[PDB]
Symmetry: C2
Subunit: 126 residues, 2 copies
């Protein structure tokens, strides 16, 4: 039931893959995504078309769950998602990603931002 | 947009962690779980108390997403979840898990079963 803000941040900076949970009606949908943790927020680059985007336009309340090694730590982030229009925020977040992953989603894409309303972390046995 | 039933099965047998997506109202909740793929279904052992179980009793329509290495493969499973009362199905599934993970959730637990109504797989670049 962890609460060490530096450990979590380190984890959120290193973790490669996160799982975005959406729902319209009572029908959940969970997809893996590359992401960066920046500001007090999760950003990812994504095609601005698809099931994920229909659901978001319908219901921007989302969940983002990350879980990995360095016993297992898992973080869950609740908040609301929205596409980024701020050019510089958008550009920072993109550079932050290349730096993270590299130190076609093709036609029409955008940067998306989940504002961290609530966050919970846990360390787990097996 | 893969469709090789043997490759997927091999993947579902080996993958360590899955992500269970639930919703009540328009509020998603995603948690990581140990699991086995058996029958045409996902089973896991879990405490029969907690947020996960309140939501399930309210809305048994769920999503289960698995994503890992052996380029990246990701599988999404849609279906309905329910606790297992069948003693032998329950016992097979439990043995299947020990064999998978080992070849406190404490008080009150159960085996849960997501019946695979629909399944989709994908292989991904980065
Ligand atoms: C490790 C990894 C990293 C990824 N990183 C990113 C990224 O940063 N940005 C990004 O946009 N995408 C990323 N993806 C793919 C991401 O899941 C896509 O956005 C998603 O696959 C397509 O989204 P959609 O809802 O618009 O798809 P749609 O094409 O509209 O999906 C419709 C149907 O296709 C199936 N489906 C969709 N996605 C998947 C999936 N991933 N696996 C199995 N079935 C699926 C579902 O059954 C769904 O109902 C990554 C995937 C992996 C595995
Ligand atoms: C890799 C790994 C494997 C796991 N395998 C299993 C397993 O097979 N069976 C099992 O029951 N559990 C497993 N867990 C833990 C699983 O997530 C628990 O069921 C869950 O953590 C508690 O479920 P709940 O909704 O009843 O929790 P509750 O205690 O009722 O949760 C209430 C609040 O706690 C927070 N929270 C709950 N779970 C997590 C979490 N995992 N990470 C961060 N915050 C959380 C959320 O903010 C939530 O709103 C595993 C976890 C990890 C990381
Ligand atoms: Na993972
Ligand atoms: Na994973």
């Amino acid at each position: 039931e962890c609460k060490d803000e530096k450990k979590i941040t380190e984890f959120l900076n290193k973790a490669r893959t996160g799982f975005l949970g959406l729902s319209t009606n009572d029908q959940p949908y969970v997809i893996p995504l590359n992401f960066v943790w920046h500001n007090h927020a999760i950003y990812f680059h994504g095609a601005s078309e698809g099931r994920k985007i229909k659901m978001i336009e319908a219901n921007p309340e989302v969940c983002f769950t990350i879980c990995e090694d360095l016993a297992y730590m898992s973080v869950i982030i609740f908040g609301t998602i929205e596409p980024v229009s701020a050019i510089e925020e958008g550009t920072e977040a993109m550079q932050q990603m290349l730096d993270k992953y590299v130190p076609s989603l093709g036609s029409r894409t955008a940067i998306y931002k989940i504002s961290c309303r609530e966050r919970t972390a846990k360390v787990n046995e097996p």
